C-alpha cells in the first residue's frame, strides 16, 4: 500500500477560515515532511506528532493569505508528496469584542456577561454561537442584545455565589455577516462572591442591605421626587467612585434644562446607565427617611454611601420598590434583571 495524505483543507480552497487550525494527516505511512507558507515563502509554525502521522499548524493563521502546503509522506509500500494551495477569508470589516466583567475579578450575584463589538453585527446567532460560556455549578443562561454591538448573558436567576464563569469569545476567523470577522478573540473568567442584593422601599424610604440573607445596614434614604421619580425594578451595581461630578447631560439631559443638574458627589455607586446613584447627599440628611427630594438618585448620609462604597461591587443588586415611578428599562444597561425570563431567554438573535 502507497501513503496517502489527507488534509483539513483542499487544494484550490478558498474561503478558507482563521477560526481553526489547518492539519494533514498520513495513512498507511508516516508524514516525513510537511511545510506551510504564505505569499512570500514565509513559514508558518506547525507540530508533527510523535507517531507521525498528524501535523497541524501551531500559531493564529492570517485573513487574505494564500497558503501553501507540501506534505511528503513514507511507508513501507513508498512514497506520496503533495502541493495544496488555498486562500484564507477576506473579511471587509473586522470587528473587535471587549468583555466585562474584567478577567481575575469577584462580582455580585447579578452580573452579566457582556460582550460589546465596536461594530454593528449583522449575524447575531453567529455572535451567539462563537461565544463560549462555562459555568460552575453549571446553570443555564442564553443571550440577549441590548443594541446593535452588545450582548448579554445570565442565567434565569441570580447567580449562586461561589460560582466560577468562563467567557471564550472565539470570533477570530468567525463570519459575523455582511463581511465582518472578529478582529480578534478575547477571553475572561471571574467568580460569583457573596449574595448582596440592598431593597429601598418608598413605603419606609429605608435602604436595607441583605448580605447572604442577613440585614446587615439600614439606610435612611430620599429618592426621586414625584416628578422626578426614582424607577421601581432590578438594579445592577457598575462602577464606585470616591468622587464625581455628575452630568445630567451624560444621561440625556441638558443641564441647563429644567431637570438637569451638575453636582460633585462623594461615594458615589452607580445602578443605572441612566444615571441612578447611591451616593453622599450631605444637603438631604433632614429628608432623608421622610420624603423624596432627589432627580432620581438615591440620596444617603455621608458615612452610608461610604459604607454602601466599601461594602457593595459590581453586580450587586439594588432593587427599588414601591415608588411612584414606571420600572427601570430592561435594555438600560443595568437593567438586564427586568426582562422575564421567557422573553431574555427566547433572545433576540433574529
Not at 478577567?103 to 463589538?117: K, L, N, S, T
Not at 432620581?296 to 427599588?320: M, T
Amino acid at each position: 500500500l502507497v501513503p496517502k495524505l489527507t488534509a483539513s483543507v483542499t487544494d484550490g480552497a478558498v474561503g478558507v477560515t482563521v477560526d481553526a487550525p489547518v492539519s494533514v494527516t498520513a495513512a498507511d505511512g508516516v508524514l516525513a515532511a510537511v511545510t506551510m507558507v504564505n505569499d512570500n515563502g514565509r513559514p508558518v509554525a506547525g507540530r508533527l506528532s510523535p507517531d507521525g502521522l498528524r501535523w497541524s499548524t501551531t500559531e493564529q493563521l492570517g485573513y487574505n493569505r494564500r497558503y501553501t502546503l507540501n506534505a511528503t509522506a513514507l511507508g513501507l509500500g513508498g512514497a506520496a508528496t503533495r502541493q495544496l494551495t488555498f486562500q484564507t477569508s477576506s473579511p471587509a470589516h473586522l470587528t473587535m469584542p471587549y468583555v466585562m466583567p474584567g478577567d481575575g475579578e469577584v462580582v455580585g450575584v447579578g452580573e452579566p456577561v457582556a460582550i460589546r463589538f465596536d461594530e454593528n453585527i449583522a449575524d447575531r446567532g453567529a455572535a451567539e454561537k462563537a461565544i463560549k460560556i462555562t459555568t460552575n455549578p453549571p446553570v443555564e443562561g442564553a443571550f440577549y442584545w441590548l443594541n446593535n454591538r452588545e450582548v448579554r448573558w445570565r442565567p434565569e436567576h441570580f447567580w449562586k455565589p461561589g460560582t466560577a464563569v468562563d467567557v471564550a469569545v472565539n470570533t477570530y476567523g468567525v463570519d459575523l455577516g455582511e463581511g465582518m470577522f472578529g478582529e480578534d478573540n478575547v477571553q475572561t473568567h471571574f467568580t460569583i462572591g457573596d449574595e448582596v442584593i440592598a431593597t429601598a422601599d418608598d413605603n419606609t424610604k429605608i435602604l436595607t442591605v441583605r448580605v447572604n440573607g442577613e440585614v446587615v445596614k439600614s439606610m435612611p434614604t430620599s429618592m426621586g421626587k414625584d416628578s422626578t421619580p426614582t424607577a421601581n425594578g432590578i438594579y445592577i451595581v457598575g462602577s464606585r467612585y470616591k468622587h464625581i461630578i455628575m452630568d445630567s447631560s451624560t444621561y440625556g439631559v441638558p443641564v441647563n434644562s429644567p431637570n438637569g443638574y451638575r453636582t460633585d458627589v462623594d461615594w458615589a455607586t452607580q445602578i443605572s446607565y441612566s444615571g441612578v446613584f447611591v451616593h453622599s447627599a450631605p444637603w438631604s440628611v433632614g429628608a432623608q427617611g421622610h420624603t423624596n427630594t432627589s432627580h432620581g438618585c438615591l440620596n444617603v448620609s455621608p458615612s452610608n454611601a461610604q459604607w454602601f462604597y466599601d461594602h457593595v461591587k459590581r453586580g450587586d443588586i439594588v432593587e427599588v420598590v414601591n415608588t411612584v415611578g414606571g420600572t427601570l428599562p430592561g435594555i438600560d444597561g443595568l437593567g438586564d434583571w427586568n426582562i422575564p425570563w421567557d422573553q431574555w431567554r427566547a433572545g433576540n438573535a433574529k
